[PDB]
Design a protein around this ligand. Structure first.
Ligand code: NAP
Ligand code: 393
Length: 315
């Protein structure tokens, strides 16, 4: 099953293309190729500062008659400096303009943490602490709901929200739309069993980001564990005659999750899509879930004091 049913009645492709760190000089080609080999879901963000170039590729393939707009599932996220209710529409409309689209299929609150509005995306104080904004998850959610009621986005969701933060929204008095998706980091070093259990139990679809462990993350260290080089996982890959990446992409699919591996390398974009022609066995699944080390590629120590920092909670 290539798509998963969302609570808005729309179907979301379970494999999408990540675009964080895809340089503007190379992401247009990336998206064009992805569309060419079957990707229909592209995961974007204003903060990735390549939405223009992603829109370039999309308009072109629309122009080329390769895909139609209704077949695409385009995701963007509201960056942290726009959580004020009076900034949300503009932030969404800028994304829409850059992407040269008239609606988004899914718009996520990118992180639960609101940051001080201004030009700078990740404002820190002298001391390297993030400068928060006086914004809260429920009003930002209300702002997101407006986007749906205005036709600008078909569905809204959240990202990097812990189960209590999700619950806050769910129990919102006057809730208009429940979150359709919770996009979270998820891979065999961070298997997220409890949050997944929670989300699924509440009818929220989970998207696994950084499924290859984000080797290109700008803050990586040599000592960190490296999923793609993990000999145990290469071993699993070798037994199925697949790449480690393909094992890492297949793993979340068999957990009823959406997954969004990133590449700008045409060969890998293609490689990464070829995950619907094998199955990981019960033991593979069991073995990969056992490699959980609660290790995060995305956890900003600069935000550990933000009130809405999601990763203090167990899940
Ligand atoms: N919601 C949020 O907070 C959030 C946070 C982080 C990520 N995400 C989304 O999740 C996407 C995926 O996560 P990510 O970008 O952090 O990292 P990832 O997808 O885990 O890893 C991408 C890295 O893997 C390399 N790679 C890709 N396919 C490969 C293959 N077959 N073999 C070997 N190396 C391969 C890529 O290299 P090349 O590109 O050079 O080929 C790149 O260096 C993002 O791009 C973004 O869309 C969302
Ligand atoms: O967030 C992403 O999708 C990928 O990570 C990026 C990407 C860009 Cl272009 C800029 C900055 C980041 C990054 O530091 N994200 C981590 C993050 C941010 C906010 C809060 C937190 N937090 O932990 O509260 C963490």
């Amino acid at each position: 099953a290539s798509r998963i049913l969302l609570n808005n009645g729309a179907k979301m492709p379970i494999l999408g293309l990540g675009t964080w760190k895809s340089p503007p000089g190379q992401v247009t080609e990336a998206v064009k190729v992805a569309i060419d080999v079957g990707y229909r879901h592209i995961d974007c963000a204003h903060v990735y500062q390549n939405e223009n170039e992603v829109g370039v590729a999309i308009q072109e393939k629309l122009r080329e008659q390769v895909v139609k707009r209704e077949e695409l599932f385009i995701v963007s996220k509201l960056w942290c400096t726009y959580h004020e209710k009076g900034l949300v529409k503009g932030a969404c409309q800028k994304t829409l303009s850059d992407l040269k689209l008239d609606y988004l299929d899914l718009y996520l609150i990118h992180w639960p943490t609101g940051f001080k509005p201004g030009k700078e995306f990740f404002p820190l104080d002298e001391s390297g602490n993030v400068v928060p904004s006086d914004t809260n998850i429920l009003d930002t959610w209300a702002a997101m709901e407006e986007l749906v009621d205005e036709g600008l986005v078909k569905a809204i969701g959240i990202s990097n929200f812990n189960h209590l933060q999700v619950e806050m929204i769910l129990n919102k008095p006057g809730l208009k739309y429940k979150p359709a998706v919770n996009q979270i980091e998820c891979h065999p070093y961070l298997t997220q069993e409890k949050l997944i259990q929670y989300c699924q139990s509440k009818g929220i679809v989970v998207t696994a980001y950084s499924p290859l462990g984000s080797p290109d993350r700008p803050w990586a260290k040599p000592e960190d564990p490296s999923l793609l080089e993990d000999p145990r996982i290469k071993a699993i890959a070798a037994k199925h005659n697949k790449t480690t990446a393909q094992v890492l992409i297949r793993f979340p699919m068999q957990r009823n999750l959406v997954v969004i591996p990133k590449s700008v390398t045409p060969e890998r974009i293609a490689e990464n899509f070829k995950v619907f022609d094998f199955e990981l066995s019960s033991q593979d699944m069991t073995t990969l879930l056992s490699y959980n080390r609660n290790w995060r590629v995305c956890a900003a120590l600069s935000c550990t004091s933000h009130k809405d920092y999601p990763f203090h909670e167990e899940f």
